[PDB]
Design a protein around this nucleic acid. Structure first.
Lengths: 134, 339, 140, 181, 55
RNA sequence: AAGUCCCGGCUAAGUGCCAACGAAAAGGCGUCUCCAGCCUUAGACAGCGGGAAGGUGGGCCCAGCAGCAGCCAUCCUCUAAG
RNA sequence: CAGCCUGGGGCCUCGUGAACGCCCUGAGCCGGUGCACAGUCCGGCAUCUCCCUACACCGAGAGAAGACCCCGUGGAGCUUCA
RNA sequence: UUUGCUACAUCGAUGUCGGCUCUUCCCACCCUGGAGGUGCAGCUGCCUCCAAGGGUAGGGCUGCCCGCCCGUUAAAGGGGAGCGUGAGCUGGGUUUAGACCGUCGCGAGACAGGUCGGACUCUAAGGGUAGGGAGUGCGGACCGCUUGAGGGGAAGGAACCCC
RNA sequence: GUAACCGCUGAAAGCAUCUAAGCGGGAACCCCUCCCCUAAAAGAGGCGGUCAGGCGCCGGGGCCUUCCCCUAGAAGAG
């Protein structure tokens, strides 16, 4: 939303039908990557996603009122080894996303676990309720 | 139903064959660009590579004024020993053949290194006088002026060889009369890379890539493994069809040699020209190469070709940006390439 | 035997070359860039441009290959493609030479013209040979 | 029809010397002098009278007679410039951003247009003078064609306003031409 | 139009009486020309200027 | 294999250089020749300025339509002109 | 969305040692013609020869009087209210 | 490009649908470029013309084609090449022999109505192709370096963001 | 250099007219600059150097294999 003109993107992480946890207080707990915004691909190359990407998933485990529903989020946690511009390598023990409202602000009001610095700039609303940033 | 697909493999470089001289040569030269007599390239060797720490010099860099990490290749730069001057002119039929050569090592150069590979001139008729003034007589009707130089690998134990290569470089500068005199001086002596280059320049690379042997189509042109079932059925590592008909069994991925090619490289900016071997030598002797013991060229990115290949360098043909000198550094990795 | 093609129509000038070819006497042509072809710029290029495959050029003239673009390439195909297809047709083609300007050692010898090829016989809207290579790919 | 024998004459004005040779015409006048070639007048014979211009031809077609009169007009226009000056006028109207133009040798540069930061340039034919006073651009010279093509080159440069906007009547435009002086 | 002429009835000088356009080839022509410059269709319609005030 | 054969005229697209074969209706004053009809030295067309008009902008309904809002007539002040 | 390694083949070397396609050895490619998709014909484009390996795109490749449709006053089989 | 007829060619075989991979072509342009008109304030539009250089996805249901739809993207153009391609492949559809079911038949059984299984051969003489090697001529033996006719190309293309 | 087209000088046809000749711009369009293989390009290139010395002979000079390895690879090659 605000920083993607910089080095928005890193080594390949995820794919369609990839399952991630919901790290907030929204009510959703488990979600599967259903689609990728923006990206355009080529023959047989599965579409991509990593940290700080407008991503589209659906609710698999969570409150019934959100079960089997469509919502937007951003990617905050990945297991991939990758190289930061200052040449450090960051990883997250699992893969998590935070659901965002269609305007851009997160739907949830709480944040679970650390987030790589990159998401905060691309989504300052996330940084608004962000607790710790790595 | 016949979805879109870019033609796979690279049709641009057909034919793909192996070079006939280990040390290639440029076929064009970037313009002199309004300056004085000096050379436009250099020779060297591929010693190894590492990663380096610098402040960004690109004024428009997104990383400007910060320390970022980047792989960097080392190029030992042994001194160059010139041989002769070659005359090119619009001859009969309006072509640019060699008018004449101008050799002189009888006045200086009691070196049998050249003798190892060429049974070169004797003192009997070292009468280049009538040759040299021929240039003077043919002055003002000359177009290009290259230079005969040789490498001195015997000053580098890393490459266990003693018969050297003699190769060429075209010189641009001010007036033609100046250039011949400029070259005339350079004969019979030794020339450092600093005599041609300075830090913060761009440089071009033409050389021979890492050979690989006869290859497979899967590897040669990155053709695709057939899906699933062929990993079990009738064969997997081949293209299915080979053309609509004998109407040109065409430029299609077919096996053959890959590597050891004459190739190209653009937009390479130097980092450091140091002279202390201890500043760059890694732990335990650089891998597969030895211990650099002459002046070296600190070039980032990747450089084509296998270790222990001569490399011939060149000014930028289509430089992306005009660089300033000295992208200063902050760290050099002396850690073992092993481990 | 030497012929000048200055201000001559290439197709027209081509003809009497051939009979001299069929005669069995060695010939030469000088200043070939000084012939012309009737027609406006668009067509004459277009009527030749259609044959292109690729662009570059990397030798002295000597090949004689499937696509001509040097100033003395074009004369050859126009004179070659107007020669007997039998074996002697190739052999007679061996006895022809092409030039730009004037070779030094042929200056002091006679030259002749073909009156039927005079520009005056044509109404107008012609282009010189050397102009073609500028558009055809000849740096010269 | 077929025009049988059409002849026209041009009375050369005083204070002018005229030279003709090799089917190449040059006219000298107090304002200036320009050489204009006429080798392309096939089917037309040109006679330079000592005190006038003799133009004759026999059995011209519909094409040629238009050509002949076409040749006639330029020659007097050639004469006209050498005596009286050609002064085209370019009036500039801008809506939101005032327009600035400066001379660069043989090239013209215009900027500060409707909001684009780029530069715009046009080419001026040699031997042609063009200046600006204010809200108007003065194009001087003897050759009539030289100024107009030069004037037009400006007009092309300022046309860029025309993409996906209804024209805002903003830019550089021709105003008038040919003051008597 | 942003297109003017040496000395004619061009619009920009305080008016909008635009030129004539061809209904067939989609190009423009002179004001009083009776046919297209390209296809000569002669079914040329004047370019609309603007709705100045009202009906 | 023999004509760069001749006269006259037309084509600017390589139209074309095609017997057996390969383009319709329409558009073209693009060009080249031919039939009508109407004005022209009692001054033709075009071109350039003026008179280029008035009771009256008559007007009917109509604030006003002051030819040209919806139907429409119509006389001399007149003359090298309305 | 591919990658590395190992055994046996496949590579090479000694010894042994076949069969398939064969009017031909004359077959490069492209338009054309013709049984309406040529190796020879026509018109161009090219085209030095010899050798080894990989590919099966073509050779309308080879394998088999098509397993389908129909004909023969041709068989066999089955059934019944022939 | 399909689809209707034609039986001129193929019945001592030109092995049949789809799909996979892979190459190329064409333009009646989907997007990208150029220009214009518009019942074009600007964005979004709508339409014409030129332009084939490049690109033109990923999924679900259906074997397909077609079709319906999901979420992005510049859009997710359409056709050819023996409905391109089996001595490269899958056998899912479909062309046998076994059965079941529905309609008809007293019966042998028929169906173009549905459903389960059902064999996919070949060591490249010749060419093409991709490499790698010897020789003759170009010219006595050589060693070395170079000129640089043509050949191929997409060697780049696209989008998003900052101001 | 061009497509479409946009211009200008301009007659035909007094005016007018971007076009008829005449002249200028004007694209992922065609070409040249880039890279890649090139003296089997038949016009088959050019330039440097050596091939000695002595009396067909002596002689040696060059090259290749053999030799040791790998920058390289199926051998060949390099």
């Amino acid at each position: 939303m605000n920083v993607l003109g910089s080095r928005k993107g890193f080594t390949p992480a995820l794919q369609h039908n990839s399952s991630v946890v919901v790290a907030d207080n929204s009510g959703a707990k488990e979600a599967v990557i259903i689609g990728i915004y923006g990206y355009r691909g080529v023959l047989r190359r599965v579409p991509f996603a990593n940290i700080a990407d407008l991503v589209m998933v659906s609710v698999r485990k969570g409150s019934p009122d959100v079960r089997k529903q469509k919502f937007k989020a951003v990617i905050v946690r990945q297991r991939m080894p990758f190289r930061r511009p200052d040449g450090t390598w960051i990883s997250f023990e699992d893969n998590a996303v935070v659901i965002i409202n269609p305007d851009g602000t997160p739907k949830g009001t709480e944040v679970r676990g650390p987030i790589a610095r990159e998401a905060a700039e691309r989504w300052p609303k996330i940084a608004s309720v962000a607790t710790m940033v790595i | 139903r016949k979805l879109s697909s870019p033609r796979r493999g690279s049709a641009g470089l057909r034919p793909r064959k192996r070079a006939d001289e280990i040390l290639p040569t440029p076929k064009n030269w970037p313009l002199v660009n309004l300056k004085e007599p000096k050379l436009l390239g250099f020779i060297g060797y591929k010693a190894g590579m590492t990663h380096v720490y610098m402040i960004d010099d690109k004024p428009t860099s997104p990383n400007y004024g910060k320390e970022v990490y980047t792989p960097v290749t080392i190029v030992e730069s042994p001194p160059i020993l010139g041989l002769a001057l070659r005359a090119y002119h619009i001859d009969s039929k309006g072509e640019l053949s060699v008018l004449v050569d101008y050799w002189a090592n009888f006045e200086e150069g009691s070196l049998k290194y050249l003798k190892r590979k060429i049974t070169s001139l004797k003192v009997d008729s070292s009468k280049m006088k009538e040759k040299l003034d021929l240039i003077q007589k043919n002055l003002n009707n000359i177009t290009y002026m290259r230079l005969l130089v040789s490498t001195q690998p015997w000053l580098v134990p890393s490459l266990g060889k003693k018969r050297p290569e003699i190769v060429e470089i075209q010189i641009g500068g001010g007036s033609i009369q100046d250039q011949l005199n400029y070259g005339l001086s350079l004969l019979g002596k030794q020339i450092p890379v600093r005599d041609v280059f300075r830090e913060g320049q761009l440089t071009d690379i033409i050389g021979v890539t890492k050979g690989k042997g006869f290859q497979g189509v899967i590897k040669r042109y990155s053709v695709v493994e057939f899906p699933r079932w062929h990993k079990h059925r009738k064969g997997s590592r081949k293209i299915g069809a080979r053309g609509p008909s004998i109407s040109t069994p065409s430029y299609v991925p077919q096996p053959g040699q890959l590597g050891f090619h004459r190739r190209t490289e653009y937009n390479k900016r130097i980092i450091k020209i140091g002279d202390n071997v201890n500043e760059i030598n890694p732990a335990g002797g650089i891998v597969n190469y030895g211990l650099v013991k002459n002046t070296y060229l600190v070039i980032e990115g990747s450089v084509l070709g296998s270790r222990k290949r001569p490399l011939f360098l060149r000014y930028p043909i289509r430089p992306s940006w005009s660089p300033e000198s000295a992208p200063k550094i902050t760290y050099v990795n002396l850690a073992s390439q092993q481990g | 035997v030497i012929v000048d093609a200055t201000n001559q129509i290439l197709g027209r000038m081509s003809t009497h070359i051939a009979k001299l070819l069929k005669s069995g006497k060695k010939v030469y042509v000088v200043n070939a860039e000084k012939a012309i072809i009737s027609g406006p710029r668009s067509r004459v290029l277009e009527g030749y441009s259609l044959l292109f495959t690729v662009k570059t050029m990397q030798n002295p003239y000597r090949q004689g290959i499937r696509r001509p673009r040097n100033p003395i390439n074009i004369v050859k195909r126009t004179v070659r493609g107007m020669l007997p297809k039998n074996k002697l047709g190739k052999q007679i083609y061996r006895n022809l030479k092409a030039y730009i300007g004037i070779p030094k050692e042929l200056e002091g010898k006679s030259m002749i013209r073909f009156d039927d090829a005079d520009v005056s016989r044509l109404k107008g809207k012609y282009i010189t040979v050397a102009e073609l290579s500028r558009l055809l790919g000849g740096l010269k | 029809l077929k025009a049988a024998y059409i002849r026209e004459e041009i009375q050369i004005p005083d204070k002018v010397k005229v030279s003709l040779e090799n089917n190449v015409l040059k006219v000298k006048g107090p304002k200036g002098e320009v050489i204009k070639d006429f080798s392309y007048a096939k089917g037309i014979r040109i006679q330079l009278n000592e005190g006038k211009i003799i133009l004759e031809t026999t059995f011209a077609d519909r094409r040629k007679k238009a050509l002949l009169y076409s040749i006639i007009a330029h020659i007097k226009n050639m004469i006209t410039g050498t005596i009286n000056g050609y002064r085209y006028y370019l009036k500039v109207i801008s809506t939101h951003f005032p327009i600035s133009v400066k001379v660069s040798g043989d090239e013209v540069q215009v900027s500060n247009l409707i909001g684009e930061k780029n530069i715009r340039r046009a080419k001026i034919l040699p031997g042609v003078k063009v200046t600006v006073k204010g809200e108007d651009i003065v194009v001087e010279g003897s050759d009539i064609y030289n100024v107009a093509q030069t004037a037009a080159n400006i007009e092309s440069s300022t046309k860029i306003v025309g993409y996906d906007r209804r024209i805002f009547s903003d830019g550089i435009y021709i105003y008038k031409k040919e003051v008597i002086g | 139009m942003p297109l003017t002429d040496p000395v004619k009835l061009q619009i920009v000088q305080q008016r909008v009486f635009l030129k004539k356009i061809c209904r067939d080839c989609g190009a423009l022509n002179s004001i009083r020309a009776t046919k297209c410059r390209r296809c000569h269709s002669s079914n040329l319609r004047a370019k609309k200027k603007e709705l100045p005030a009202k009906k």
